[PDB]
Ligand binder design. Structure first.
Ligand SMILES: Nc1ncnc2c1ncn2[C@@H]1O[C@H](COP(=O)(O)OP(=O)(O)O)[C@@H](O)[C@H]1O
Ligand SMILES: Nc1ncnc2c1ncn2[C@@H]1O[C@H](COP(=O)(O)OP(=O)(O)O)[C@@H](O)[C@H]1O
Ligand code: ALF
Ligand code: ALF
Ligand SMILES: [K+]
Ligand SMILES: [K+]
Ligand SMILES: [K+]
Ligand SMILES: [Mg+2]
Ligand SMILES: [Mg+2]
Lengths: 442, 413
DNA sequence: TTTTTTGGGTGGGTGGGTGGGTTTTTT
């Protein structure tokens, strides 16, 4: 709404120059995604906008990076033809990639390094340009490395990522050795514009200030905050969001219908994208987990269950006001094991999980909230924070201090920091990100 | 009460000419295999009769291609000496191939292109005639490309076939670049001669007319049709046939005997001929999996069981009305349940009553046509549900073969 | 510990096949 003076000056810095790699970053709520809209309508069809999560893709009026490139939901081994499959000779995506001019990538901080490198390789190989990063496509990335770090399941996946790239962050990709990333910073908060004192407290919390932390507990710790009408609960873990959605569900007058999931092979309960014994009444707030094969709904689309029958569920979407019918999807559990004949790690399906792609959305994980502006939010701390950027994203969703509430006081012992982000954030004050070597692997 | 005149015309054409390769083709039930019996008598039993499936081999009074050349049950790579191995210096098979004059091959539509090519090569190498197709053996092929297509397993021998032949059908074999195939056509149906209206419906279904499909749906749909005694259920998929074989057994009064086998060395659970364990009850239609050295039973005759105690298998056949005893060899008794069967196992048979349980639907070219053409009268055919036009499967290769053979010749360039 | 995405037929053909894979034979 309205480009600010620092927004419009980034707009011209990024549009009227031939340099093909730009990053627009800044604290939460500075208007990065709103500047994306202004860029969306200049390039306006010459640009493909994408984001790593469904929620962030809907906020940016685009698609998930996986959905567009048709990437699988597993480790994308470096330029591996098993994972980065090239599109068909007469495919819609081939023309899409071949005529593409600009690619806008929002919430780039949550983009794991293998995902970014897969995009590079996908664009290079299909566009006939092995010598130019992203095949010659002007890439305009927007995000914040102080917000949620990428999801790296410990074990073989994390070891492959460390050995191949040194770390998981998008800025640790090797493509940045081939092209310098011009950095443009937005400072003035537009989400909390009319509450400057709250915005300043969030700035100090971004710099790990301990006295800002103790002030925050003094002002925003109210355990009853989850009960206030129309406020969303955020939570670090999925199972903590279920236990809290539980009570607002059994406070609705509708008849219960339980959708039961079928699991085959080895698929642990800890890996469930939603609950195997999932109950819903009508009028319940829900979020969708998978994109519609025919594009009537998407991953991260919010809505209200509208009528529910044995295996066919229909929900009124909040995005567009249309009633969509949700038939159950299948999830696969993937395990990576070293193959000694071909001398590489290979992914293996070991179990499956089919269930309706929905979970109640009175309480959500912080990951599904990143990108949104919320009216009010209550953060249920649960068993604690585990991800770099988790606390910050939760606290930055609202416009006003009064709109924020906490489950319990947070201590300085649970602040998390990543040395790689500190190296990145320090270097890009100079204005660009150009790497000479790769990152070391430990 | 003998051969039809067009059966005689085809007989005289393949026997009174100098041409080395012939194809007798026509719609289902036209008497192709009946003509084959005449060819066998004409060549005084010195011809060799092969067929791609055990059902077709038993129907043709011959044996499977694989059994004769001792090919393995995998892809047969082009002229590959580790897939196509010739017999030893004094093998009965070597003497058989060296003295062979005529090879009759029934249900050629189901012969996959690598099978035909392996036959060509096996006969060339063994007979030491490398520049003559089939080693100079006169080949008489009989079959129908609008019946079941050859099976391309869901490994990807499919692309090796695409890379090496461009398709699985027998007429895509490279031997047709060296020899022309003389095509003789039969038109009038003998299996449905008593029901000309039904024969004319099948003719119309053969060419895909949808007004005929609606008439078939309104006439032959009877879900209760598989519960009549004596009728055989055909299914598209193997486990669908086993799933309906078990209820007919479980509902049957009289209580079972369980047969399980012996293991030795290395054997995966479906490397065995029949399934791990087998429960049977006296008075049950089931059919055999292999022949025996003397000659009393044959792989593909079905009936009921008269007595049953653990290792003598007293069961009464239909082929003769005669008697058999089955005892296993390496290791289980080669008998499987036969209330429901795949349509692949039924191609070539003339059946008294047939019910097509469609299950999840048809998936192969010619699958529906075979199931409908087994019986003599329309009243002998029942369907579990009506057929939709979007279930008709057509391979374009078959249309170019069917079109180019209208001048009597098939060859490749 | 959080994200991304779909594979079988006891999920079921009024959900549809340009959402996409699989069935069948041969010792
Ligand atoms: N220039 C602006 N003027 C007024 N409001 C703005 C402006 N830029 C952003 N906003 C508001 O700030 C809120 C969050 O901005 P957003 O674009 O989500 O920032 P970011 O992408 O940096 O988190 C939005 O609700 C938007 O309306
Ligand atoms: N000339 C004929 N006279 C009487 N019956 C015949 C004649 N030819 C074939 N039949 C009968 O028609 C049925 C189908 O014949 P078959 O040889 O199996 O056809 P095809 O192999 O072409 O499908 C069999 O019952 C057969 O006995
Ligand atoms: F930086 Al944001 F919503 F995109 F806080
Ligand atoms: F062609 Al047939 F039975 F051999 F119909
Ligand atoms: K299907
Ligand atoms: K499906
Ligand atoms: K399906
Ligand atoms: Mg944003
Ligand atoms: Mg025949």
């Amino acid at each position: 709404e309205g480009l600010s003076s620092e927004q419009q000056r980034a707009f011209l810095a990024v549009t009227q120059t031939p340099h093909p790699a730009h990053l627009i970053t800044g604290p939460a709520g500075t208007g990065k995604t709103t500047l994306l809209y202004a860029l969306q309508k200049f390039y306006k069809g010459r640009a493909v906008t994408l984001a790593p999560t469904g929620t962030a893709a809907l906020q940016a009026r685009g698609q998930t990076v996986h959905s567009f490139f048709r990437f699988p939901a597993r480790l994308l081994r470096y330029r591996h033809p098993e994972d980065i499959r090239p599109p068909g000779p007469h495919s819609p995506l081939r023309k899409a990639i071949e005529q593409m001019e600009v690619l806008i990538l929002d919430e780039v901080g949550m983009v794991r390094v293998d995902l970014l490198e897969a995009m590079d390789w996908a664009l290079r190989k299909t566009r006939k340009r092995l010598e130019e990063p992203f095949g010659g496509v002007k890439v305009l990335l927007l995000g914040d490395t102080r917000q949620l770090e990428p999801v790296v399941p410990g074990g073989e996946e994390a070891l492959y990522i460390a050995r191949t790239w040194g770390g998981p962050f998008f800025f640790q990709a090797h493509v940045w050795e081939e092209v310098a990333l011009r950095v443009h910073r937005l400072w003035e908060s537009q989400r909390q514009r009319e509450d400057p004192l709250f915005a300043e407290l969030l700035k100090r919390l971004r710099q790990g200030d301990p006295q800002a932390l103790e002030t925050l507990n003094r002002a925003a710790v109210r355990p009853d905050g989850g009960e206030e009408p129309g406020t969303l609960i955020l939570t670090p873990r999925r199972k903590e969001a279920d236990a809290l959605n539980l009570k607002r569900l059994e406070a609705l007058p509708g008849k219960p219908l339980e959708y039961q999931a079928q699991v085959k092979g080895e698929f642990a309960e800890t890996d469930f994208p939603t609950e195997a014994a999932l109950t819903l009444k009508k009028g319940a707030q829900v979020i969708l987990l998978r994109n519609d094969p025919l594009g009537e709904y998407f991953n991260g689309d919010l809505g209200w269950v509208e009528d529910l029958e044995a295996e066919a569920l229909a929900v009124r979407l909040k995005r567009n006001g249309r009633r969509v019918v949700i038939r159950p999807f299948v999830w696969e559990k993937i395990v990576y094991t070293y193959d000694s004949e071909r001398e590489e790690i290979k992914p293996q399906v070991v179990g499956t999980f089919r269930q309706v792609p929905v979970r109640l959305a009175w309480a959500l994980t912080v990951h599904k909230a990143q990108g949104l502006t919320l009216d009010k939010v209550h953060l249920e701390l649960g068993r604690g924070l585990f991800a770099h950027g988790q606390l910050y994203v939760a606290l930055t969703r609202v416009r006003r201090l009064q709109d924020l509430s906490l489950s319990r006081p947070i201590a300085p012992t649970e602040l998390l920091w990543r040395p790689e982000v500190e190296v990145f954030e320090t270097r890009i004050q100079e204005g660009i990100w150009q790497k000479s070597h790769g990152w070391p692997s430990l």
